[PDB]
């Protein structure tokens, strides 16, 4: 049993009991998110449509992340041009409890 969900221009395959980092959304930690958006069943035939209606999955925001820092560097030879910018990209963790059809 599994689903295929949609959050933040992306699609992930979720089990019940799956801790998963997702693009950051707004729920204060411990708040609960049904994401009325779902794309696939794992007992099959239900696929369909963009999105099977009536089904969603529930996950509880564990808290809001800031990822490890990417160093994004830009250099241009012979023109005396260099730039340095630090980047941490905010996320939210989710635990997937149960998937309702």
């Amino acid at each position: 049993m599994f689903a295929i969900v949609k959050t933040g221009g992306k699609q992930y395959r979720v089990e019940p009991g799956l801790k998963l980092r997702v693009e950051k959304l707004d729920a204060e930690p411990g708040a609960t998110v049904e994401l009325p958006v779902l794309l696939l069943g794992g007992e099959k035939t239900v696929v369909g449509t963009p999105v099977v209606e009536g089904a969603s999955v529930v996950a509880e925001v564990l808290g809001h992340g800031r990822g490890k820092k990417i160093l994004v560097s830009k250099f241009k030879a012979k023109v005396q041009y260099r730039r340095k910018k630090g980047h941490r990209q905010p996320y939210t963790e989710l635990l997937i409890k149960e998937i309702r059809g």
Binding site: F2, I4, K10, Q11, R13, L39, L40, G42, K44, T45, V47, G48, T49, P50, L71, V72, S73, K74, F75, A77, R82
Partner: protein
């Protein structure tokens, strides 16, 4: 007053060299060749960060296309099937379907195969 270099130049050379740890030869041992090698690293990572996107999708496709030629059709038709059929799921990322969940893949093959058929 006079302000000599003191500790400032030593410290910046130190920053960079630490970054270049692991690089071959003098490129890890000399603040000049480190700063040079680094420049290059900095651009390739950024280049390749836009390339990893290209890189990964490319793989997904071959894998999709591989699996449904087993079921005897194209990739190029397969996507069109899914496009009409509304099944705009795949997000070619989940050809983990195609590997891990075969009969889910098959069911998709037909949900595809019947539109224009």
């Amino acid at each position: 007053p006079r302000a000599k270099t003191g500790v400032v130049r030593r410290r910046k050379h130190k920053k960079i060299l630490k970054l270049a740890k692991g690089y071959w030869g003098l490129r890890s041992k000399s603040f000049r060749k480190a700063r040079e090698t680094l420049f290059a690293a900095g651009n390739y990572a950024y280049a390749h960060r836009k390339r990893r996107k290209r890189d990964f999708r490319r793989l997904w496709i071959v894998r999709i296309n591989a699996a449904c030629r087993q079921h005897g059709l194209n990739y190029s038709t397969f996507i069109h099937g899914l496009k009409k059929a509304g099944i705009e799921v795949d997000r070619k990322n989940l050809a983990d379907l195609a590997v891990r969940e075969p009969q889910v893949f098959a069911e998709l093959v037909e949900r595809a195969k019947a539109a224009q058929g």
